[PDB]
Amino acid sequence: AGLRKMAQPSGVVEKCIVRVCYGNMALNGLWLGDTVICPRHVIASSTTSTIDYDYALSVLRLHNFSISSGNVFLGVVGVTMRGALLQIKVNQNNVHTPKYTYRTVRPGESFNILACYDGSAAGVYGVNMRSNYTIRGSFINGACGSPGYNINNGTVEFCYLHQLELGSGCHVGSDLDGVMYGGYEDQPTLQVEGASSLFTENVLAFLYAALINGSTWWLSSSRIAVDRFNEWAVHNGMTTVVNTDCFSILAAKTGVDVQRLLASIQSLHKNFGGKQILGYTSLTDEFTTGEVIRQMYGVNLQ
Amino acid sequence: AGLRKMAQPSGVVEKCIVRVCYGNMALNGLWLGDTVICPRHVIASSTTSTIDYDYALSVLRLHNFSISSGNVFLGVVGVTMRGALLQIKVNQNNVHTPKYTYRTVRPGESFNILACYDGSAAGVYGVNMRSNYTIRGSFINGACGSPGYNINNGTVEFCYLHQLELGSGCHVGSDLDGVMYGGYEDQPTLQVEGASSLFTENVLAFLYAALINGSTWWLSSSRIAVDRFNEWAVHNGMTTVVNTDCFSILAAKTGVDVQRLLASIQSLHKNFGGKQILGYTSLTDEFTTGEVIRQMYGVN
Numbered sequence A: 001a002g003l004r005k006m007a008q009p010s011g012v013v014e015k016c017i018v019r020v021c022y023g024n025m026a027l028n029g030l031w032l033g034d035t036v037i038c039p040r041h042v043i044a045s046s047t048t049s050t051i052d053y054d055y056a057l058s059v060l061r062l063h064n065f066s067i068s069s070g071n072v073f074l075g076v077v078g079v080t081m082r083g084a085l086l087q088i089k090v091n092q093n094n095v096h097t098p099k100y101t102y103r104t105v106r107p108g109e110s111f112n113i114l115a116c117y118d119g120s121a122a123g124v125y126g127v128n129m130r131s132n133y134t135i136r137g138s139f140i141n142g143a144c145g146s147p148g149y150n151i152n153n154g155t156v157e158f159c160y161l162h163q164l165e166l167g168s169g170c171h172v173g174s175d176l177d178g179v180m181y182g183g184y185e186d187q188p189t190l191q192v193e194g195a196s197s198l199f200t201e202n203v204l205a206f207l208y209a210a211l212i213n214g215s216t217w218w219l220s221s222s223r224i225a226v227d228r229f230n231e232w233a234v235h236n237g238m239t240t241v242v243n244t245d246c247f248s249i250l251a252a253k254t255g256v257d258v259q260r261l262l263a264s265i266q267s268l269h270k271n272f273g274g275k276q277i278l279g280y281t282s283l284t285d286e287f288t289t290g291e292v293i294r295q296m297y298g299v300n301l302q
Numbered sequence B: 001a002g003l004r005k006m007a008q009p010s011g012v013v014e015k016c017i018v019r020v021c022y023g024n025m026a027l028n029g030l031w032l033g034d035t036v037i038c039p040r041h042v043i044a045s046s047t048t049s050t051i052d053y054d055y056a057l058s059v060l061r062l063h064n065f066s067i068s069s070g071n072v073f074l075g076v077v078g079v080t081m082r083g084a085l086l087q088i089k090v091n092q093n094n095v096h097t098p099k100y101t102y103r104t105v106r107p108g109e110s111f112n113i114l115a116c117y118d119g120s121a122a123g124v125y126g127v128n129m130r131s132n133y134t135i136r137g138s139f140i141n142g143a144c145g146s147p148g149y150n151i152n153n154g155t156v157e158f159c160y161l162h163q164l165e166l167g168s169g170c171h172v173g174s175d176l177d178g179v180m181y182g183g184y185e186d187q188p189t190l191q192v193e194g195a196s197s198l199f200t201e202n203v204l205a206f207l208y209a210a211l212i213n214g215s216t217w218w219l220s221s222s223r224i225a226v227d228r229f230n231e232w233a234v235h236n237g238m239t240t241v242v243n244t245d246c247f248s249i250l251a252a253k254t255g256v257d258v259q260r261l262l263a264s265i266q267s268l269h270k271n272f273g274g275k276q277i278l279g280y281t282s283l284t285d286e287f288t289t290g291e292v293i294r295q296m297y298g299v300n
């Protein structure tokens, strides 16, 4: 019983964190094989104005780097640009490199953040990529380079390196190929995130979990067609629903079909009437169907 | 900026999880030094009816245990009873045992849960001990023996070993000395948890975190004294405010006194759910002052 946002165990990722310092800038890097990957703004001089990163790298002084895993210091062999990241070739292989891949996540997908400071893991929590390509993180100064990851069958899938915080407090990263999520710039210029729409498929997964956990007061006798809901959704800050075959077994276990939940979402989007659903007082879109099925039943969909 | 319920990195505890099987029962244990600690109901026969744990232990055959760390099986050399736990002596020392202590937590305290199945960690998340001595976990069958703990300067402080789930879904465990939180029985019974209440000291911590993050729409322009709030609190599902010293550090940084936050709690309670605070239910009680200070300022 229960539904909690949770992270996968962080042990295999913890051994990949290093401290990367250039001059007076210090942040975190990921050490995999003989490469350290980190945000390129570690070589930015000052926080304003626009940075010519190509020029900065051209006048780089390699011995001005300090890269360490605990008190293991890594010598820098070379540095090249990789989008919004640096690829730093170092002189030692991380013998604790896990089996890993890179994958770029899409809005609505969940992953784990390993929040790091001074090159050491400090905390771990689950996040979900918003439609505006930001995440609801908790980071303070020094967390840049903190990685986001999933673990599938022993393979670490890296999908995020923390880059910056927008004025509203939402958090922006790049994928490990250096492509910034949402096209935000790694520059100090003013930029604002777009509006956030609730990922409706995730809201549906949450309401199914609510039913499985005995929360039913909110459920509607009505029902609304997918097509009609989608018309309403785009005027009410929620995404459209594409298809319901991922709710197949959830629909069977509870007896409630998507159309009934869609009508429930419409009533609950205003307010919860002073009531709560699993402790929430507004709809949450942070849980995917995969997370719900895993937490309800211990099945990992592939 | 931001506020999230965070777990500490779980690596040092992952290496201490083992699978403990006896008869038709399988759960998780904690392997520290040459001992494996697990709930004693692993030696109960079935779940249909009550059993005498002392009798169960008196006729136990050591070789009926199967205890494994990964694919490495441990020999069992002795077993004794420790409250609602077993202390199983094994024939190998865990070379990955961290520096560790035990401590029994109080209602309102936070700790980390490493949710485990078949002797291997599956997820990690923070919790907070409720006033009825339950936690709001996420567990399914086979999670028993999952540990709860805190990490302070590399020392692991174990405070919880998961024992059972109640009808309402809340979760019951024991401390590592075998003392069940809340006095619940490790028996198949009709027991139900006591009344739940919001932990007001944690709501105060959360509201300070909101202020630190620039959230002020809910801040009352007036104040209420603690004694008057405590009268109201016990009639509105909240705990009384007993210790105020823990908020000195947060008042010193926000310049907002506790009395003003108490008046804000009353107003939030009267329109419960009308607006979120930092993307949370306004009367969130899962964050402690310690958690807020760490996340806002990095201070240990």
Ligand SMILES: CC(C)(C)c1ccc(N(C(=O)c2c[nH]cn2)[C@@H](C(=O)NC2CCCCC2)c2cccnc2)cc1
Residues within 6 Å of the ligand: A025, A026, A027, A041, A044, A046, A047, A048, A139, A140, A141, A142, A143, A144, A163, A164, A165, A166, A167, A186, A187, A188, A189, B001
């Ligand atoms: C150079 C550049 C791209 C402008 C920059 C500057 C600072 C940082 N921030 C580092 O904390 C940091 C810097 N170097 C090591 N850490 C922080 C940050 O984003 N403030 C923002 C201020 C407005 C516009 C620039 C970014 C930060 C804080 C909290 C959580 N996340 C990040 C990130 C990027």
Ligand SMILES: CC(C)(C)c1ccc(N(C(=O)c2c[nH]cn2)[C@@H](C(=O)NC2CCCCC2)c2cccnc2)cc1
Residues within 6 Å of the ligand: A001, B025, B026, B027, B041, B044, B046, B047, B139, B140, B141, B142, B143, B144, B163, B164, B165, B166, B167, B186, B187, B188, B189
């Ligand atoms: C023997 C005893 C004390 C009655 C018992 C029986 C079953 C378990 N539960 C095991 O899953 C389990 C048991 N052994 C290995 N796994 C589950 C459980 O609590 N059902 C309860 C049924 C009502 C009251 C008794 C316990 C469980 C589920 C989810 C999370 N936590 C635990 C726990 C304790």
